[PDB]
Amino acid sequence: KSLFVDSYSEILFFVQSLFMLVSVVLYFSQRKEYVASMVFSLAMGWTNMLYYTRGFQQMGIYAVMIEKMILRDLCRFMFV
Amino acid sequence: LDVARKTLKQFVNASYTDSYYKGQTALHIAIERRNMTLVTLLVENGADVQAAANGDFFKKTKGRPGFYFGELPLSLAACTNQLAIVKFLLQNSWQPADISARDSVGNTVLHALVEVADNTVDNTKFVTSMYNEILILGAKLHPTLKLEEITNRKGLTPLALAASSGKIGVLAYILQREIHEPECRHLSRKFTEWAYGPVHSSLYDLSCIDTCEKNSVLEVIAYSSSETPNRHDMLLVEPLNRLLQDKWDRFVKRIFYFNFFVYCLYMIIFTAAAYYRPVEGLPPYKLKNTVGDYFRVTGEILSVSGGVYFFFRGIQYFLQRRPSLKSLFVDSYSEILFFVQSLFMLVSVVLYFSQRKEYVASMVFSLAMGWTNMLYYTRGFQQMGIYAVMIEKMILRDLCRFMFVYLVFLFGFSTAVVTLIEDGKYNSLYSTCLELFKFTIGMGDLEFTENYDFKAVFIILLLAYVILTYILLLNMLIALMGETVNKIAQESKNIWKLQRAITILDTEKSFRKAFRSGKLLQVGFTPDGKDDYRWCFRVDEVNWTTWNTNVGIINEDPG
Amino acid sequence: YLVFLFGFSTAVVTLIEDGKYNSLYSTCLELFKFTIGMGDLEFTENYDFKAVFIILLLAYVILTYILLLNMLIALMGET
Amino acid sequence: VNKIAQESKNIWKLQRAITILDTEKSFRKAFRSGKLLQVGFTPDGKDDYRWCFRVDEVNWTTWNTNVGIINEDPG
Amino acid sequence: IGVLAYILQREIHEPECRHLSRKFTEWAYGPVHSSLYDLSCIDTCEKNSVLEVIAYSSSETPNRHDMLLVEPLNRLLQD
Ligand code: NA
């Protein structure tokens, strides 16, 4: 329960690594879908830079607010 | 008692030799513990009241621990809120304390009192009460001594020190000081010229406020560094705001309007000259024999002249104010912007005579900055000035944070998309970054290319980018701007007032007309019979509640 | 906003060498289109120094569309 | 945004605390403060040493400061 | 959180029991006094330190985001 309600950053970094490893597996299996897996890994890797805003007070609080907006407002809006 | 032996001195006056506590004596310890009887006992046996505690622990800040009080027992008693000990040390029959004594850094007891102030209610109450008591006692003991114009090693009076350090409570107390007792009313700075019914006219001493030849309070506050704790709030202290408004309305507003008009003319001429630039070959361009050609060359000469003028104004500012390389890029935004515009103009001139067509690029950058620099003149109007201050604050906080996060997201999704793309017109990072940025301005395509395998991946990437940036981050930016606007009204008004104060001081130094108020006789005379004339600012007040108005009016026959 | 629009329009039209957008009115209209969600960002190529053109357009966009309009919404909320 | 300022600051502080603990476990340098004698001694005569964090305070209101100070000669 | 705040700042001002306190005064001069905060079982315990317990607590813990504000812990983390 704290897995998917806490530990967001651990999950995000792990999922990025999973996309990378799936890309490796597809690449040596002669499949061109390795590119799709790799670009998903790349996009997640760039968005995971937001983890390091912690370490600076203003940017860190901004990132926390981004998380809260996603989890409350964007989610309700997206359902409707 | 049982150790003081007349076999007395050099033992009742022994002091620490340690570098940390160097100078501390038994009198210092007795005062610190608040023992009146012990202090009298030490004073009786010949303890020196001018002993200086020069140790590092008693230094201002060097070394994290320590308490600074002026190093002297009188200053120690003053800065610890011990009135009885101060009075005893000043008026003892054995060795009176020298009220005018200066510590190692030149600070007197008033300077030390200003130094221990920290802008808190109880601290302010105690510090100002002790300041008033010390002033009264000094006047009684030395009617001719001029306590508040003694400077420290840095050339600061207690008032100048307070203003330059942000001790706003002390500054407010000093500027409105009203001492309502005979034989010491000359120490006051606020006077009542007359009172009739509910309305009474007040006189505010202006000495060392707007002209001092060393450092006036206005100059000290206006040109203080950004680190000064209360720099934007100190101009709100009662007399200063009215004095600045008086200067504005009397002579500075017209000069500011003339400057704004001249800048508008300069920008119009620059725009016209740039608009009609020849497009024939390389510069320099031969002068045709036509009226339009002569007017264009005139416009170009005027534009270069304005660029030279602003370049030299920037150099002059850098030399006269000597920014500390931190207030350079944290303060002085407008000076930097005007200087950079002038630099673009001069680079354009250099390129133009070097036969390079990049002079046009430099010139258009100069032109765009010149037009956006018009926002400087919104100061001079309250509503537009506060609006410009809010624009600055939004840029510096909300837009900056948003842009960092947004550029990270844009670059990441652009690299993913361009990697997915196989070939074609969009297989470059620049083109795909531009396509994704178009989504931010309501122009995103969502089908700008088909040069890929796995259309599902392409659309998933684009939709994720859209949801994260357009739907989430931009709307969040609006909400955060709303929060900021809600929180910065008073700060923005105070910043605008400080900006106008800077303009007023700059005009007064680059415009004997700019002279505060009238020279008036306000306390009658000093302790000596001589009548004292002081430059005073008159402020009218009305009070329907405290009808008594028991005051030492200067002039009867009000008005 | 009108100060910013006029300034960036004069800069852009000065940078433009010739063609359909070498008039102040046309370029002012092109830049105003950004305010209503219709800005092109490639409405002309009649220049040297494409980098200067895009830098001017991006600066104008950031200052007006991203900053000033959203600030207007926030100030309206306060009012 | 209006309602979550304090919550967001506290969450950020907890996040940085997690980072600090993780670094201390994956980096004997990371040791809090000085070992000081602080109450003199236990009920038994033995002197007790405790690792203590020093915090400087200033109070202009309660001048009394009647305390059982450990060290004279402050500083 | 209330019990935690009380415990971490415990000052017992009586003889023969002052050893129970966790907050001490090392020295006081004029208006400034230096305080000593006991750190035993705070940042290293080998069983469960207060910092480890708070930082790695579950999301259901009532005051998990507020407990780091208790006086000594914030300064210790910043240090
Ligand atoms: Na649109």
In this complex, do D73 and B21 lie within 8 Å of one another by their Cβ atoms?
yes
Is the separation of the CB atoms in C26 and B376 below 8 Å? no
Element (H, E) at B129: helix B121-141
Tell me if D72 and E27 make a contact (CB, 8 A cut-off): yes
Q: Are B409 and B471 in contact (CB under 8 A)?
A: no
Mutate to test the interface with A, among D1, D4, D7, D8 (most CBs of A within 10 A): D8
Contact A40 B468 (CB under 8 A): no
The candidate with the shortest Cα–Cα distance to D36, out of E11, E36, A35, is E36
Q: State the best of D60, D63, D66 to mutate against chain B, taking most chain B CBs within 10 Å.
A: D60
Inter-residue contact B339 to B311 (CB < 8 Å): yes
On whether the CB atoms of residues B549 and B200 are closer than 8 A, the answer is: yes
Concatenating the DSSP letter of every residue in A6-50 gives: S-HHHHHHHHHHHHHHHHHHHHHTT-TTHHHHHHHHHHHHHHGGG
Task: List Cβ neighbours of B501 (8 Å cut-off, separation of 6 or more).
Answer: B218, B221, B222, B235, B244
Task: Give the total residue count for chain D.
Answer: 75
How far apart (Å, rounded) are the C-alpha atoms in residues B35 and B27?
10
Q: At what angle do helices B168-175 and B238-247 cross, to 10 degrees?
A: 70
Q: How far is B163 from chain A (nearest CA, A)?
A: 31
Give the number of other Cβ atoms within 10 Å of residue B109's Cβ. Answer: 31
Q: How far is B20 from chain D (nearest CA, A)?
A: 9
- Distances in whole angstroms, Cα of residue E46 to Cα of each of B244, D17, E11, E43: 65, 18, 26, 10
The torsion defined by the Cα of B423, B428, B433 and B435, in degrees rounded to 10, comes to: -40
B27: tokens are: 């009198």
CA distance E59 to A7: 10
B168, B230 contact by CB (below 8 A): yes
| Residues in chain B that come right before a backbone break, where C and next N are over 2.5 Å apart | 7, 511
Q: Which chain C residues are Cβ-neighbours of B484 within 8 angstroms?
A: 74
The rounded distance, in Å, linking the Cα atoms of B346 and A23 is 55
| Paired tokens of E48 | 């469960």
For residue B283, which phi and psi values (nearest 5 degrees)? -75, 165
C-alpha to C-alpha distance for B492 and B494, rounded to whole angstroms: 5
Query: Helix crossing, B429-440 with B400-420: angle to 10°?
Result: 130
CA distance B482 to B479: 5
Segments of B129-215 assigned E as strands: 190-196, 199-205
Pair C9, C24: CB distance under 8 Å: yes
Does the distance separating the beta carbons of D16 and A64 come in below 8 Å?
no
Taking an 8 Å cut-off on Cβ atoms, the answer to whether A39 and B471 are in contact is no
| Contact present, B292 and B312 (Cβ < 8 Å) | no
E72: Cα separation from own chain's centroid:
5
- Residue to mutate among E25, E27, E29, with most B CBs inside 10 A, is E29
Do B300 and B285 form a contact (C-beta atoms < 8 A)? no
B533: helix, strand or coil: strand
The one-letter amino acid code at B215 reads N
Q: Using omega within 30 degrees of 0 as the cis cutoff, is the peptide bond preceding B284 cis?
A: yes
How many distinct helices (H) and strands (E) make up chain B? 21, 4
Touching status, chains A and C (3+ beta-carbon pairs under 8 Å): no
Helices A34-47 and A8-28, packing angle to 10 deg: 160
- Between the alpha carbon of residue E42 and those of residues B272, D51, E55, E58, the distances in Å are 72, 10, 12, 19
**Half-sphere exposure of A16 toward its Cβ, with a 13 Å CA cutoff?**
15
Q: How were these coordinates obtained?
A: cryo-EM
What is the stated resolution of the deposited model, in angstroms?
A: 2.2
Of B473, B470, B467, B413, nearest to B442 by C-alpha is: B470
- Chain B, nearest residue to A46 by Cα: B412
**CA terminus-to-terminus distance, chain A:** 25
What is the 3-state secondary structure of B190-252?
A: EEEEEEECCEEEEEEECCCCCCCCCCCHHHHHHCCCCCCCCCCCHHHCHHHHHHHHHHHHHHH
Cβ-defined contact of B367 to C7 (cutoff 8 Å): yes
Bridge partner list, E35? D55, E25
Q: What are phi and psi of B205, to 5 degrees?
A: -60, 130
**Which residues in chain D have Cβ-Cβ distances shorter than 8 Å to B480?**
1
User: Which is nearest to B431 in space by CA: B450, B415, B454?
Assistant: B415
Please indicate whether chains E and D are in contact, defined as at least 3 beta carbon pairs under 8 Å: yes
C40: burial class by Cβ within 10 Å (0-12, 13-18, 19+)?
middle
Q: State the distance from the centre of ligand 1 to the C-alpha of C69, rounded, in angstroms.
A: 15
The label of the residue with tokens 């994720």 reads B464
- Output the DSSP codes for B302-349: HHHHHHHHHHHHHHHHHHHH---SSHHHHS-HHHHHHHHHHHHHHHHH
What Å distances lie between residue B494 and A43, B231, B238, C72, CA to CA? 45, 9, 14, 21
- Note whether B9 and B46 are within 8 A (CB): yes
Q: Are B201 and B194 in contact (CB under 8 A)?
A: yes
- Beta E23-29 vs D34-41: how paired, if at all? unpaired
Dig out the tokens for B100 from the structure: 């005018």
Spatial separation of the C-alpha atoms in residues B521 and B519, rounded to whole Å: 7
Distance, in Å, from the CA atom of C62 to the CA atom of A75, rounded to the nearest integer, reads 28
- Vertex A65: Cα angle to A62 and A68 (nearest 5): 155
CB count within 10 Å of CB B515 equals 15
Pull the structure tokens for residue D15.
Answer: 């996040």
Residue with the two structure tokens 């270069």? B304
- The DSSP symbol for B15 reads B
**Alpha-carbon distances of B413 from A34, A75, B406, B461, B539, rounded to whole Å:** 17, 22, 11, 7, 64
Q: Mind spelling out the 3-state secondary structure of B19-83?
A: CCCCCCEHHHHHHHCCCHHHHHHHHHCCCCCCCCCCCHHHCCCCCCCCCCCCCCHHHHHHHCCCH
Contact between chain C and chain D (3 or more Cβ pairs less than 8 Å apart): no
With contact defined as beta carbons under 8 Å apart, do B232 and B495 qualify? yes
Q: Phi and psi dihedrals of B114, rounded to 5?
A: -65, -35
Half-sphere exposure in the Cβ direction for B532 (13 Å, CA) = 17
Rounded CA-CA distance B483/B398 in Å is 10
Interface D-E, measured as beta-carbon pairs within 8 A, has a size of 125
- Whether residue B363 contacts residue B300, with contact meaning beta carbons closer than 8 Å, is answered with no
How many CB pairs below 8 Å do chains B and E form together?
13
Q: Which of B518, B451, B368, A77 is nearest to C53 (CA)?
A: B368
The CA-based diameter of chain D, rounded to the nearest angstrom, is 58
Hey, how many other C-beta atoms are within 10 angstroms of the C-beta on D49?
Answer: 10
Of B401, B420, B467, the CB nearest to A58: B401
Nearest to B421 by CA among B444, B454, B466, B445: B454
Token representation of residue A16? 């990025």
Contact B99, B74 (CB under 8 A): yes
Residues of C comprising the binding site for Na(+)?
Answer: 37
Dihedral sign for Cα atoms in the order B519, B522, B524, B528: negative
Helix/strand/coil (H/E/C) assignment for every residue in B241-310? HHHHHHHHHHHHHHHHHHHHHHHHHHHHHHHHHHHCCCCCCCCCCCCCCCHHHHHHHHHHHHHHHHHHHH
Q: Quick check: B500 and B248 in contact, CB under 8 A?
A: yes
Separation between Cα atoms, residue B118 and residue B128, nearest integer Å: 12
Question: In this structure, are residues E43 and E37 in contact, taking their beta carbons and an 8 Å threshold?
Answer: no
**Cα of B401 to ligand 1 centre, how many Å?**
25
Place of tokens 């409105």: B176
Report the C-alpha gap between B380 and C35 in whole angstroms.
Answer: 28
Q: Do A64 and D12 touch (CB under 8 A)?
A: yes
Cβ proximity of A63 and A53 under 8 Å: yes
State whether B415 and A42 contact (CB < 8 Å): yes
C31 alpha carbon – ligand 1 mean position (Å)? 14
Whether residues B464 and A43 touch (CB distance < 8 A) is answered with yes
